[PDB]
Amino acid sequence: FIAVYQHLRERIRQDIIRTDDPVDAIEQMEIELARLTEELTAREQKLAI
Amino acid sequence: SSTHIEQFMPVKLAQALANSLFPELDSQLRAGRHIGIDDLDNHAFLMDFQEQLEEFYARYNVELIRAPEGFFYLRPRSTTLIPRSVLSELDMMVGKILCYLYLSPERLANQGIFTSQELYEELISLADEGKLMKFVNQRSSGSDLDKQKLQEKVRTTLNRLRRLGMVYFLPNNNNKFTITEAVFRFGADVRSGDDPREIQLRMIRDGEAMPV
Amino acid sequence: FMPVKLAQALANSLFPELDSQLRAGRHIGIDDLDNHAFLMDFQEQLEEFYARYNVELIRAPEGFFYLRPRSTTLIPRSVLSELDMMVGKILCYLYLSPERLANQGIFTSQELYEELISLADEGKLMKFVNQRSSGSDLDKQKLQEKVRTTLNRLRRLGMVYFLPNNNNKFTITEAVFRFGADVRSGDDPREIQLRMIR
């Protein structure tokens, strides 16, 4: 279990996501996902016109 | 049936190797270049056939690796078919400083464009100036000729990092440049809040880094 | 899609190694039984494979294979030193007829050292080591060191095979002909080789 956690801890991407707690990181990631989805929606709307 | 691609190779792998992007990419990769998100063509290509490329390169005793930041690179094994080399300590100083510069929200307003002078100023602000000067010349004591020599060595190493794909110069001005996420590999010794010795051991075991 | 025989060829276990070697500039002679046979079998497709890199796969008339980059080569290029071609042309000269009776195909470093010193002009020797040099022992020692170094480079190219022991004795392969002169109807190889060396 410890090993698993250790493993995961390294795999964090950048500073705003530097919650050293993986599980805590999950939600942040997902937040990013939602953010990105909104940006994509706006961009594809621009592309249509 | 006989005389059928599947007998010798997976279709997706052959499809990848037949692409017009492959030779460029292959050449570059072998040379040590890192691939980030900005060079769309290449990046996208990599993404599309990741596992085939990994499997392919495996033949060479080399790992095609994907960092969490989304950048690809080559890591040779001890039995590698392709030579392996290490960066100089000055390259590391400039690398860790470029990393802190990327993170710095205070300079995010520049839209990524930095000047050699700003990099140099940040570096001297943090590291021991007079002790670092020992690497430029064994007799340095703060003389301007030696300070200009240091600046020229920085200018040279920064150009080497550009070939590695870690930084891109502006199209018309060479005194200014832009960063990429590939620089985060210089933080591999501290991304986890643990004992530095154990981290270092783990890294050398994985083939990521050597001592001097 | 991809041609079936090309996929077969590059699926072979020998390909990665040979690829690595070729990209380095090594020459494949008749000595390397398996590699040479592999190239003979799949030349028609390997030529096309490497043309995608703007690099040419050539089979020399003597029989050995090698790569030649174009100006638009996709592979980073590198270039030999003057002393390197000097030594190469010397080795081409040593691929002589009396060689068979003189050494039975096995030479020593001293043969080449003394031949180089005897046959070349002093001025280009100084240009090789350093212009400030003048007929001094240390200069000759440095020239010996450089000779060993360039000989190892050539061994990397596959030109010369060291006999497997620490001592510096070797045999010359046919691929050394790449340094050789142009041959015209009836011309004597010794004379033309010497004419270029002069």
Next chain:
Amino acid sequence: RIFSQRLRQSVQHYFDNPWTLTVANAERLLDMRDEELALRNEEVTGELP
């Protein structure tokens, strides 16, 4: 306030445990140095048709 301490201390104390990254450094393709181009000059002559 997570990475400031984490990374600054690494740069400040690097020389107590200097370490270096590994990179792929494939060999360069050796080629013949181009000698000065020597053309064939022969002052050819002949009877004109």
Next chain:
Amino acid sequence: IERGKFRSLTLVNWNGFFARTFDLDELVTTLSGGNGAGKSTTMAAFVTALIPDLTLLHFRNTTEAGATSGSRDKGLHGKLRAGVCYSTLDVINSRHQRVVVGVRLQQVAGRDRKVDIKPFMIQGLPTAIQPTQLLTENVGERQARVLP
């Protein structure tokens, strides 16, 4: 509008030709002669003078047509003799201007059978000058010499 036309083709010091000039026709020009006479060689000289890009030029036999071979030898070198060589075209422009394009060819000494090319162009040449004479010097009793 009057379309431009190719007036003539000139060869100097090619394999079998010392100095020969073919006058082209307005519609069709035919070359005849037994095997090995030199017809395909004339074709090759023309195309070389038109596109001197040495990376492209590749003169395969008529047999083996369409096979991408990567042959060791492109087949041009052997069609040239030692010394200097030329291949030139005379053209009448739609503006009724006489222009002479061409190339200077020369074998490269060395084991590799390489070739050197240097293009050139001449404008305003008087209509009375023939390229065959312009490219040669009369030395001796009707024993002309070629000039670099």
